[PDB]
Amino acid sequence: GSSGSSGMLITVYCVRRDLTEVTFSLQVNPDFELSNFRVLCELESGVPAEEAQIVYMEQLLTDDHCSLGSYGLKDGDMVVLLQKDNVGLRTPGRTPSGPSSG
Numbered sequence: 825g826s827s828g829s830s831g832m833l834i835t836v837y838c839v840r841r842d843l844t845e846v847t848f849s850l851q852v853n854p855d856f857e858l859s860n861f862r863v864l865c866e867l868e869s870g871v872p873a874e875e876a877q878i879v880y881m882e883q884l885l886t887d888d889h890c891s892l893g894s895y896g897l898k899d900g901d902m903v904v905l906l907q908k909d910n911v912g913l914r915t916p917g918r919t920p921s922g923p924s925s926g
Contacts (some may be wrong), residue, residue, distance in 0.1 A: 830853060831837065831851045832892070832897060832899035832900075833849070833851060834849065834851070834892065834897060834901055834902075835848075835849045835850075835900075835901065835902035835903065836848055836849070836865050836904075836905045838869050838907065838916065840906060841869070841905075841907045841908065845853060846869050848868045848869065850864050852864060852892060853892070853893070854892055854893025854897065854898075855891060855892075855893055855894075856873055856891060856892050857889065857890070857891050858878060858885060858888045858891060858892065858895070859873065859888040860882065861878065862878065862888065865878075868881075869905060871907045874908075875907050875909065875910050876905060876906075877904075877906035877907070878884050879904040880901075881895075885903075907909045
């Protein structure tokens with residue numbers, strides 16, 4: 825089919841992952857939103873973009889709106905993936921309203 829033309833290698837390094845730690849590479853563009861890079865790492869590693877972190881330059885990237893090229897990502901760069909906890913596994917919380925009548 826087709827491949828593309830321009831792109832940059834982005835190495836990801838998972839840590840926590842609930843005891844797993846995985847290391848894989850990805851091929852994206854410099855004009856690719858961070859969120860996009862997450863969905864990818866979320867497709868490879870599996871970590872949820874929501875609970876998917878991206879560390880670069882020693883500083884944690886806290887912007888999904890920002891892009892890769894913007895931050896300063898080039899072909900042959902490496903990043904660390906940190907998995908958070910937001911599965912909220914504490915009883916099935918879900919109930920409608922109803923003050924009157926009890």
